[PDB]
Every structure is written in structure tokens, then in C-alpha cells.
Design a protein around this ligand. Structure first.
Ligand SMILES: Nc1ncnc2c1ncn2[C@@H]1O[C@H](COP(=O)(O)OP(=O)(O)OP(=O)(O)O)[C@@H](O)[C@H]1O
Ligand SMILES: [Mg+2]
Ligand SMILES: [Mg+2]
Lengths: 149, 977, 80
């Protein structure tokens, strides 16, 4: 079932080996989850903790979930709204995939941004022409918004 | 000439302006004014042809009322056409309707199309002989019980300029070998078919293809296809774009006389491929029978007539050299049901024929070519006695239906208690069908119809129970009144509601309401409500008749308790959406700029406003928004900019503001983008960045002489003014005078607490509020569509995309659903043909039928519903959908024990709605405060909301593990509070 | 036993998809191919042959699908 599938994934998250990221229902709402992704150690996001909101569609897993960043982040494929340009979230989605797969995808995008498919051309431009300037900004943004108070 | 878009809107998106212009210059003649003819007349009148002329001097008989909803018992004995004219005249003020008492061949030249019903074959031959040679479209159709026929002859040289109504195919090219082997971009389907013609554009390698000369397509794969050796010019092309060309098509129709021996059939059901030939013989036999009995048809279930009828069938079969055996049982049914007059059959054939009439008068869509024979024989009742005695007339208005179903079945129909959700297009046709059928006219019968909507002008084009004077009134109320007039026996048998079916109305449409219902019928325009109703029908175990339309397309679905799957059991395509990255900086289709423009409309005239009114509304909007919004700065700057920084004092300041926006969204942003990604940019792979879907944009230099630039200023300035209550103007002079004095602020591609405290205290502006713009697609004077069209076309210019006009933008931005009376009528008929199966209580799933059709291409197809999935729980066979556990309001612990003890299963998951109540993986501490709680209490706490006093049950979903740790599917649980 | 045959799948828009198949092919296989040719997910494919909606777990032969047989690929509509 739709709700039962979301549950199967929830139960399976606790049966998986201790992972870096975390995810689960908000106020016991199986269709509205909150997730956290640790900024990868091999990136200018290291040290930061990034929160995401996850809304599953009534016809999940046939239709992909809406994933949005609630923590600000300096990244080429993520904007001030939290929107993300990631294949798995749209045309590369199939009922076989899961949130775990998605979180891992988002985590991989963090360590390896995709400047050729920019959502924020300004940031992608820096990533392409002055990588060190981008990493400085990425680290600074992580410091200002992803360390939590 | 100028079409009334306010009235024809939805239909215009189906037919197009040109088709409707030809329609307005076309007169139509309709012979026969019984149920079938009036239905055809009705749809043609609503569609908007030049005029409708009726011919039917036959007196009104009581049986004609079984389907002719414009005749009353007081009209009995009065020529049908005369009684009907004034009723049809009221449908469309743009379509005059009249009656002719006599016909002549030369008189037929006054019409573009002649429709003939209730006419003998010999008379048809005479009529068609003339029309065929005089370039006059001819359509004949008849309704005979559960059987129907339609024949079209639009002449030997009919031209069709559009055979399906589908948009021309388009796509991006990657490369074109000199051999003509074209290849789409990475993972791109061209969707072309062999024989199609396509032209090109933006092709780099052979400027010759960009000519505009369409070529023949030779599909090789879903991504590749051949057009022919292009060695002559260029050796290899690339980065181009093909576009299919729809070339006119000549369709040659044979006359009735010349095609009787070898008819070309259109099959409504491939599962009954053998019937059309049998019906072709039968319908001819009916006419030959009538000729031997002074025009009278065989009597209901009368064996003597059927035997004589069968003899005609043999003779006729022989005469046209039919080398196939006649199915005696099948054929005799046509005799037994000859006098049958069902409103469902008139709705079905009437709507289909009306569409053909429009095809003849517009040359749009593929016509039926040429004989369409149909039956809905499975609709024949089996739980009652069907005999000459039970089917004989009783001098009753339902005699037409009784002739087929019998008097016993007439009572089952009269005693039905129904719920109709939606009183729009499908709703009106359904209500009319129910009225003619005598649904709910009995003592225990009743009809409940609900809809929260009010009548609008564009609804009149396909919601025939409403009139221009009813605009502004509630649909449900008007419809109820309208059908009480069609059938007085319904007076006091109908209750109308103005409720939106859903969660919030469960107080009104609760357990008591449902328990008494015989069945539910949906007539909705959104999937959300459909899913909701479906869930409730599954819970209350009530049958559901579902249907939908889209342009000339339609479908019906029947849901039977403990027999079929439900509506929500299957998947449908998702609503149209676009990649966020594409919309933001890389549009390549007009839909992309229209979506962007809608968002721009919201971000300038709505979102900012609500923020300003919230800052002056709530006590701590800044405090909350400081940690409730995903971008505090935007909310802040909105207050500042809209309260001081950019607050206009006069309309001229609005114009100035509008001028600034132009550079912000159609110039500077584009320059910044080109700065970030120069036209010579390359990918990390080495390929050019701006290729395929990414189109290198060009900044726009504002110029009041460019119409789109001007429309944007006028729309944006007028909308901004609306935000501040300032009066706007349209006099071009004022804009020129203001724009002339504009000093373009210097711009160059670049390489919070104070903003808050500098805001005037809310208490220093109490009483002052801004008016946010609420998107309204149907008010052509509010500047909404004007703004989105202009904004979208300017961005289109930026990315070199072909612009769309206001008419098209209104359709895209407004998410308007194409619709017309024809397909609406057809689904209603199919739905009512299924309704009688439910009332007959059919148990065999193959007796039921889900239907699908596209009137634009003469396609109809049917399939048996899908059986609900079964499963076994401890040996017992359970229906995965309809079976449920009926337990009391015990505590969590108790419920868990019940399953372990009884079903011998371990409750691993329990949920109420979207809320997880219990999980076998939750922490012991958590479960400690919950286990002792009763389900009801557990729900109220978790959902943080208290149940309603009317709440009588609670639905829970549960997951269990087989004693061997494995999982075992289990039905849902009904907690009786 | 089984054998090769050419079948046609016509959609509600009028488009016609031609397929080369073996009467032994499962309905599941056919859906897979339609997904490659049209990109349409199997879960959205409503195929009908001779009055019957094709279900997974069966073979074309189970529905007596012959050579040159035509099937329909339909959809449910939401307006009205
Ligand atoms: N949840 C609901 N409960 C009851 N009625 C509903 C619900 N949702 C929609 N409807 C009604 O279903 C009908 C749909 O019919 P239709 O689309 O022909 O009319 P419309 O929405 O007025 O027309 P248009 O789409 O052209 O503006 C409407 O009258 C609408 O109000
Ligand atoms: Mg409406
Ligand atoms: Mg609607």
C-alpha cells in the first residue's frame, strides 16, 4: 500500500547499519518526514547538519517524493527555496527507489556538485572558474547556517 | 464572425475558432423528434451551428416520453416537432430553431447537413440519393432498445484538415546523416509514424531542410527515423528541430444505396466483431417489417413478430449475399426490443451523432466511415421476468423503457436512492437520464445531489439544465428544479446540497446518509474528490459509477462491492509538471515561460501583498516569520518595498515601477546569466553548454513601440495599481509621457536587522491594507492573462521561443479543461447503461463494462472491470479491498492481543489516516503511555485533535507478521466507537 | 505451441504502436516494451484486447491474441 510502503521503508531504516543521515515522520505523519544529512567530510559542507523536508505523494512510490532543503546551503543545484535539481527526484525515479537511496543521492551531490545543470548559475560559475572561492563560500555558509544554534 | 468566447470557451479549446466559424454558416436539418432526435438537436444547438430546422409531423405518444425530455403528457396527440421547437430555441440564443411541416428534395439544398432518425430504409435511400449527389452531408441513426446504428455519408470528395485533433509532433535533432537517418537528442522519442510529414528548423549542416518543405517519415526506432538521402545538400546536419505537418486528407464516402451490399464498419467493441454484420441485416429487416405493418415495429417480446422478422432477415441476408450464419437468438432480440426507447441509448448515440454533424460542417476530425452498429445487450435484466406480458405497454410515460426492461424492473428503478456528486456537465446529463428513467420516483426512492459551485456563463455551453438567467445561482438547486419539470413525479423526491464532498462534509454525508443509499454516481472534475468518494464507498460497501471527459474523449468505470477493484486501485498519469531547473533559467517551450510568468504574477502582486497584510495583522509576524519562513529577507524587503521603498502615490509611479520590472526580468537577469555562462561556455565533458534544451538567451532592450513590451507595462502597471487601490488608465499617451522620462538605472553583471526596525509600527497603519491579486482566468478585464501572456512572450523572445497569444495562454495558465456537450452526453449514456446492471444485481464481473472513447476519431472500446484481489488469512479467503475487521473501541494492547490470540499474527503497524498509531519498532517507553489507551483516545492524542460528536466509526490500517516472521497482508479495521 | 505474430496497440489519441511479439510473451513483458517505446510506466498501462483488460501474470496466448490483433491502450479522464 501507499502508507504501508512508507512504513516498510521506515521500519527498514531502523534495520539498516548506523548511517550518517537520518529521516523519519513528523508528528507521526507518515507522509511528512524530516531528514538530516551530514555535510560530507570530503567537502566544504563538513561539520554542517542539513535538514530536509519530505512529502510523499498519495500515489507513492509510483510518483516521486517532494524533497526540499530547509537549511540554507551554498550549492549550484540548490536554491534559497530549498529546491533541488536531481535526476532521481524526477525522471530517474521508479517505485523501486527509496528515501535512503534519495538521501544518499543528495549526499553525493553535496560532495560532487553538477555545474552543467545549474539551478543557481552564479554559484555554478564560481565552482567552474574559481573552485577555491566556491569552497570558501561553501564553508562560510555552512558555518553561518548549518551548525545549528 | 467574432465568436462569443465567454460562452464557448471550453468548446473552443476542442474545435478551434475556424471550425466554429464554418459551423456558424451551416444550417442543419433534423428529421425525427423523439428521444434520439431531440438529443442530437440539443447538442447541435449548444454547439453553435447556424440554425436547426426540425421535421416531425408525427403526433406525440405517451411512450415517446421515455426519452424525449422536452415533451410532457399534455403534449400527447400534438406533432412532436411543434411541441419541441420552443424548448430547443431556449438553449442557445445564437442558434435559431424552426419547424417545417413538409419536405422536398430541392429544399434539402438549404442545409450543409441532414440528420435522419425514425425513417424507413426506402425513405432514407430516396433522401440520400439526392444529398449524395448534391454535396450535402448525410447522417442517419436509430435507437432500438439496447441496439443502435449510425451511418454517415459526407460525399465522395470530403476533405478533412485534421484527423485527430492532436498537436503536431515536435522534437530536437542531434544529427542527420547524408542518408537521411535523423537521431533525436539523448533519450528523446520523436513519436512519429510511417507516412507522417515533417519540416525542419535550426538544422545546422544543410540550410536546405530549414526550407519548410515537409518530407515523408520512415520510422526506424523510437529515437531515430529516416526522411531520405540528403546527400545533395550537406554531408551531416545537427542541432536542429523537426515539426510534423498535418496535410489535408480526402475521404470518399459511398452513398447509402451503393454501400448496403458491402458496408464498411466501425467497431465499437472488438470483443463483438461478429455482430455488426448481423445488425446490418437486422436493422434493414425492421424497416421491411414496418413496411408490411403500416410502419409499426415488432411488439415487445412478441414471438410471432420475431419469427416474421427473422424471415425478413433471411431474405435480406440472401439478397446481399451474406456468407455468414445468422445468430437467431441475437437477431431476434432486436425484434423483441424494437420498440425499446432508452434514454441511455439516446444520450450515447445522440452525443456521438452530434459530433459527426460538427465534423461534416467543419472538416475537422475523422468521420465515422461508414456503418456504426452498437449494442449494450449485457444491460438486459436477468433477475426479473422479461416477457411479452411484463414488457407490454401500460399507457405510461416509461412504456419505452418497460418495453425492454419490464414493469417489475421499473419498480426497482423507481425505488432507487441515489447520491450524485457534482452538478456540472456530467451531472446535468445524468440528472436528465435519471428523470427519464423514473429513477427514485417510487415511495422508497430518492435523489440527493450536491455541488458547492455556482453557475457561470461558460458552463451553459454544456450544462443544458441551466440558462443565462440562472448565472450566479447554485448548480445543484437549479438542476433539481429543472428535472422536476422534465418529470413531475420527481417533485419532492430530490434533495439538493451545496456541499463540497470530502472530509469537511462527513457531518452531513455520514453513516446514516450512506446506509440508505443504493449507489453513488460521481460527476467530478478532479482526482482528489474521486479518490475520496471511492474510499467512502469501499467503507460503506456501496456501488460507485464513475466517469470523466477531456475534449472529445471520455471514460466510465463501475465499482461493485466484493466484486471489482475500486477507483483508487489503479494508477493514472501524473498532472503536467516541469523540471525546476528548466523553468528557472532554461526554457525551450512556451509552456515553460507561461509557468514562469504565472509564478512572476504571484511573486509581484500576491505573495508580497499577503506579507504586508500579515505584518499589519498578526501581533508577531516578524517574530514568527523570523523562524517560520524559508527566507526572512524576502518577507522583510517585501514589507519595506511595498510600504515605503516602492509604494506608489499615483498611477504614473506604477508605470515607472512597471518599467523597472521589465529590465529586472527580461534584461538584467539575462545579462547576468550570459555572464555566468557565456555563449561559448562548455560542459565538464567538453561539449557546448548552450545546446539542445539550453537556448542561449538575448537580453531585451525596452521599447514602447514593441507591442509585447507595451502590453507588459500596461498589465503590470494596472496590477500594481490594483494592489494599492489606485485608479489605472489605458490611454497610451500617459504611458508614453511617463516612459519617455525614464532614466534607466546603471546595471552591470556582478562578479537585515536594520531593514526591520526601519518599518513603520503596525499600530501606525491600522485600517490600511493592500489588495492582493487573486488569479482569475475567466475575467478578461482584470489584466491577469494579459500580464502572463506578455511576461511569457517576452521571456519567449529572450530564449527565441515562438510566442503564444492570450487565448492559448489563458488555456495553459488557467489550466482550463477542454470540454463540450457531445462527449458529456456519451459518458452519461454509458454510465446509465451500467446503472441498470447494478439495479439488476448482476454478480458476474464480465457482465459489467468499463468504457473509453474518443469521438474525434470514432474510437470506442470496452473491457470487463478488474476483479478485486483475494487473499487468505489463516485459511479463510479475504477480499483485500472490501473485507474489514469489525472490532470495538478496545485499547491498543487489547487489539494487539486480539490479532495474536485470534488471527495468530503480530501487529507490526497500526495507522489512522496518515498517522502512525503503533509500530513494533517503537521504543518501550513510548509504547508505555499508549498501550493502555483505547484506539479512539490513541487517535485523538497522536493527531492532536478531538473526534467529532457525529463520528461513529474509525478506520485503521494494519500490518502483521506471519508466525514465521514473514509478512501477511490483512484487511483494514473498522473501530465502532 | 507458441509462435511469432505482429500486434498493434492503438491509444486514445489515435496513435498506433506496432509490436513484434511471441504469443508466449507475458503481459508483463509487453508492458516493458511499451515503456521503452513510449516511456509509459507499466503501472499506468491499461491494455485491452477483445473486451478484456490484460493483467500481469498472463500471456498473450491466454487472451487468445492472434496475428495482426489490435489492442487498445487507454486512460481515465478527469474533467466533466
Ligand atoms: N468535492 C466536490 N464535491 C461536490 N462537487 C464537486 C467537487 N469537486 C468538484 N465538484 C463539481 O463538479 C463539477 C465539475 O463539472 P464541470 O467541470 O463541468 O463544471 P465547472 O468546473 O463549472 O466548469 P469549468 O471547468 O469549465 O470551469 C462542478 O460543478 C464542480 O463544482
Ligand atoms: Mg465552475
Ligand atoms: Mg471544472
Amino acid at each position: 500500500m501507499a502508507l504501508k510502503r512508507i512504513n516498510r521503508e521506515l521500519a527498514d531504516l531502523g534495520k539498516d547499519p548506523p548511517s550518517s543521515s537520518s529521516a523519519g515522520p513528523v508528528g507521526d505523519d507518515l507522509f511528512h518526514w524530516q531528514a538530516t544529512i551530514m555535510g560530507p567530510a570530503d567537502s566544504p559542507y563538513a561539520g554542517g547538519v542539513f535538514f530536509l523536508s519530505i512529502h510523499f505523494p498519495t500515489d507513492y512510490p509510483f510518483k516521486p517524493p517532494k524533497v526540499n532543503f530547509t537549511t540554507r546551503i551554498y550549492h549550484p543545484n540548490i536554491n534559497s527555496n530549498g529546491s533541488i535539481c536531481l535526476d532521481i527526484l524526477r525522471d530517474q525515479w521508479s517505485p523501486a527507489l527509496t528515501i535512503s537511496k534519495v538521501l544518499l543521492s543528495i549526499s553525493s551531490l553535496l560532495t560532487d556538485p553538477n555545474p552543467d545543470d545549474p539551478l543557481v548559475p552564479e554559484i555554478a560559475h564560481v565552482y567552474k572558474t574559481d573552485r577555491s572561492r566556491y569552497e570558501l563560500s561553501a564553508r562560510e555558509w555552512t558555518r553561518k547556517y548549518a551548525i545549528h544554534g | 464572425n467574432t465568436i462569443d468566447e465567454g460562452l464557448y470557451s471550453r468548446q473552443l479549446y476542442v474545435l478551434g475558432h475556424e471550425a466554429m466559424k464554418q459551423m456558424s454558416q451551416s444550417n442543419v436539418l433534423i428529421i425525427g423528434c423523439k428521444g434520439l432526435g431531440v438529443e442530437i438537436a440539443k447538442n447541435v444547438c449548444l454547439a453553435g451551428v447556424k440554425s436547426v430546422t426540425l421535421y416531425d409531423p408525427q403526433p406525440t405518444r405517451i411512450e415517446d416520453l421515455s426519452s424525449q425530455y422536452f415533451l410532457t403528457e399534455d403534449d400527447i396527440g400534438v406533432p412532436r416537432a411543434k411541441v419541441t421547437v420552443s424548448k430547443l430555441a431556449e438553449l442557445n440564443q445564437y442558434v435559431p430553431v424552426s419547424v417545417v411541416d413538409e419536405l422536398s428534395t430541392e429544399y434539402l439544398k438549404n442545409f450543409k447537413c441532414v440528420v435522419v432518425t425514425e425513417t424507413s430504409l426506402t425513405k432514407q435511400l430516396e433522401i440520400n440519393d439526392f444529398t449524395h449527389k448534391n454535396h450535402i452531408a448525410y447522417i442517419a441513426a436509430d435507437s432500438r432498445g439496447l441496439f443502435g446504428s449510425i451511418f454517415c455519408d459526407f460525399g465522395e470528395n470530403f476533405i478533412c484538415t485534421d484527423t485527430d485533433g492532436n498537436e503536431p509532433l515536435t522534437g530536437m535533432i542531434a544529427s542527420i546523416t547524408d542518408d537521411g537517418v535523423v537521431t533525436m537528442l539523448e533519450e528523446t522519442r520523436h513519436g512519429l509514424e510511417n507516412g507522417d510529414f515533417v519540416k525542419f528548423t535550426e538544422v545546422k549542416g544543410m540550410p536546405g531542410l530549414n526550407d519548410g518543405t515537409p518530407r515523408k517519415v520512415e520510422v526506424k526506432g523510437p529515437y531515430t527515423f529516416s526522411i531520405g538521402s540528403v546527400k545533395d545538400l550537406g554531408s551531416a546536419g545537427y542541432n536542429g528541430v523537426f515539426t510534423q505537418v498535418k496535410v489535408p486528407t480526402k475521404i470518399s464516402f459511398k452513398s447509402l444505396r451503393e454501400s448496403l451490399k458491402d458496408p464498411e464498419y466501425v467497431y465499437p467493441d472488438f470483443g463483438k466483431m461478429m455482430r455488426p454484420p448481423q445488425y446490418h441485416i437486422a436493422f434493414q429487416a425492421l424497416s421491411a417489417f414496418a413496411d408490411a405493418h403500416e410502419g409499426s415495429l415488432p411488439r415487445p417480446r412478441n414471438d410471432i413478430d420475431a419469427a416474421e422478422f427473422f424471415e425478413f432477415c433471411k431474405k435480406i441476408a440472401s439478397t446481399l449475399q451474406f456468407d455468414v450464419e445468422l445468430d437467431e437468438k441475437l437477431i431476434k432480440e432486436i425484434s423483441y426490443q424494437a420498440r425499446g426507447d432508452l434514454v441511455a441509448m439516446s444520450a450515447f448515440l445522440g452525443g456521438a451523432v452530434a459530433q459527426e454533424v460538427l465534423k461534416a460542417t467543419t472538416s475537422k476530425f475523422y468521420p465515422l466511415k461508414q456503418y456504426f452498429y452498437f449494442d449494450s445487450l449485457e444491460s438486459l435484466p436477468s433477475s426479473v421476468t422479461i416477457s411479452e406480458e411484463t414488457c407490454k405497454p401500460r399507457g405510461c410515460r416509461y412504456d419505452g423503457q418497460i418495453a425492454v426492461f419490464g414493469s417489475e424492473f421499473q419498480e426497482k428503478i423507481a425505488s432507487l436512492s441515489t447520491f450524485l456528486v457534482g452538478a456540472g456537465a456530467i451531472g446535468c446529463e445524468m440528472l436528465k437520464n435519471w428523470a427519464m428513467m423514473g429513477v427514485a420516483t417510487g415511495e422508497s426512492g430518492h435523489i440527493s445531489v450536491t455541488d458547492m459551485d455556482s453557475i457561470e456563463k461558460s458552463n451553459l455551453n454544456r450544462q443544458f439544465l441551466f440558462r443565462p438567467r440562472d448565472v450566479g445561482k447554485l448548480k445543484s438547486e437549479c438542476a433539481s428544479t429543472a428535472v422536476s419539470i422534465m418529470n413531475p413525479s420527481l417533485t419532492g423526491k430530490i434533495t439538493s446540497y451545496q456541499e463540497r464532498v470530502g472530509p469537511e462534509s462527513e457531518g452531513i454525508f455520514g453513516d446514516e446518509f450512506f446506509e440508505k443509499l443504493s449507489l453513488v454516481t460521481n460527476a467530478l472534475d478532479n482526482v482528489e474528490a474521486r479518490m475520496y468518494v471511492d474510499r467512502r464507498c469501499v467503507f460503506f460497501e456501496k456501488p460507485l459509477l464513475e466517469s470523466g471527459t477531456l475534449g472529445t474523449k471520455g471514460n466510465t468505470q463501475v465499482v461493485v462491492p466484493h466484486l471489482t477493484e475500486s477507483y483508487g486501485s489503479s494508477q493514472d498519469p501524473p498532472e503536467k509538471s516541469f523540471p525546476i531547473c528548466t523553468l528557472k533559467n532554461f526554457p525551450n517551450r512556451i509552456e515553460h515561460t507561461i509557468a514562469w510568468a504565472r509564478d512572476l504574477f504571484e511573486g509581484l502582486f500576491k505573495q508580497p501583498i499577503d506579507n504586508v497584510n500579515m505584518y499589519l495583522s498578526s501581533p508577531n509576524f516578524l517574530e514568527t516569520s523570523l523562524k517560520t519562513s524559508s527566507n526572512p529577507r524576502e518577507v522583510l524587503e517585501n514589507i519595506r518595498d511595498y510600504l515605503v521603498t516602492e509604494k506608489p502615490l499615483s498611477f504614473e509611479e506604477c508605470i515607472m515601477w512597471a518599467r523597472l520590472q521589465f529590465d529586472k526580468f527580461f534584461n538584467n537577469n539575462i545579462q547576468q546569466l550570459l555572464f555566468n555562462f557565456p555563449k561559448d561556455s562548455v560542459t565538464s565533458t567538453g561539449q557546448p553548454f548552450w545546446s539542445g534544451p539550453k537556448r542561449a538567451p538575448t537580453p531585451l532592450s525596452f521599447d514602447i513601440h514593441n507591442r509585447e513590451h507595451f502590453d507588459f507595462i500596461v498589465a503590470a502597471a494596472s496590477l500594481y495599481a490594483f494592489n494599492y487601490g489606485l485608479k489605472s488608465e489605458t490611454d497610451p499617451a500617459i504611458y508614453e509621457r511617463v516612459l519617455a522620462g525614464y532614466n534607466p538605472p546603471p546595471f552591470a553583471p556582478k562578479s537585515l536587522k536594520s531593514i526591520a526596525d526601519s518599518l513603520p509600527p503596525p499600530s501606525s497603519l491600522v485600517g490600511f491594507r493592500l489588495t492582493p491579486a487573486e488569479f482569475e482566468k475567466d475575467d478578461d478585464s482584470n489584466h491577469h492573462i494579459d500580464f502572463i501572456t506578455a511576461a511569457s512572450n517576452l521571456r519567449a523572445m529572450n530564449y527565441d521561443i515562438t510566442p503564444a497569444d492570450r487565448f492559448k495562454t489563458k488555456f495553459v495558465a488557467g489550466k482550463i479543461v477542454p470540454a463540450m456537450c457531445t462527449s458529456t452526453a456519451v459518458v452519461s449514456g454509458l454510465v446509465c447503461l451500467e446503472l441498470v446492471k447494478l439495479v439488476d444485481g448482476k454478480k458476474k464481473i464480465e457482465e459489467y463494462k468499463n468504457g473509453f472513447f474518443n469521438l474525434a476519431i470514432g474510437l470506442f472500446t470496452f473491457s470487463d472491470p478488474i476483479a478485486s484481489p483475494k487473499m487468505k488469512v489463516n485459511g479463510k479467503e479475504i477480499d483485500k479491498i472490501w473485507d474489514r475487521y469489525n472490532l470495538p473501541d478496545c485499547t491498543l494492547q487489547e487489539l494487539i492481543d486480539y490479532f495474536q490470540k485470534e488471527e495468530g499474527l503480530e501487529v507490526t503497524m497500526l495507522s489512522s489516516g496518515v498517522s502512525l498509531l503503533y509500530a513494533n519498532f517503537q521504543p518501550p517507553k513510548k509504547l508505555a503511555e499508549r498501550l493502555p489507551l483505547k484506539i479512539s483516545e490513541l487517535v485523538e492524542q497522536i493527531t492532536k485533535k478531538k473526534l467529532e460528536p457525529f463520528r461513529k466509526h474509525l478506520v485503521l490500517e494494519i500490518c502483521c507478521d506471519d508466525a514465521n516472521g514473514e509478512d501477511v497482508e490483512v484487511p483494514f479495521i473498522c473501530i465502532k466507537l | 505451441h507458441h509462435h511469432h505474430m505482429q500486434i498493434f496497440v492503438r491509444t486514445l489519441t489515435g496513435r498506433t504502436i506496432t509490436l513484434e511479439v511471441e504469443s508466449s510473451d507475458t503481459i508483463d513483458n509487453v508492458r516493458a516494451r511499451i515503456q521503452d517505446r513510449e516511456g509509459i510506466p507499466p503501472d499506468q498501462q491499461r491494455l485491452i484486447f477483445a473486451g478484456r483488460q490484460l493483467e500481469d501474470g498472463r500471456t498473450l496466448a491466454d487472451y487468445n491474441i492472434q496475428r495482426e490483433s489490435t489492442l487498445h491502450l487507454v486512460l481515465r479522464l478527469r474533467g466533466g
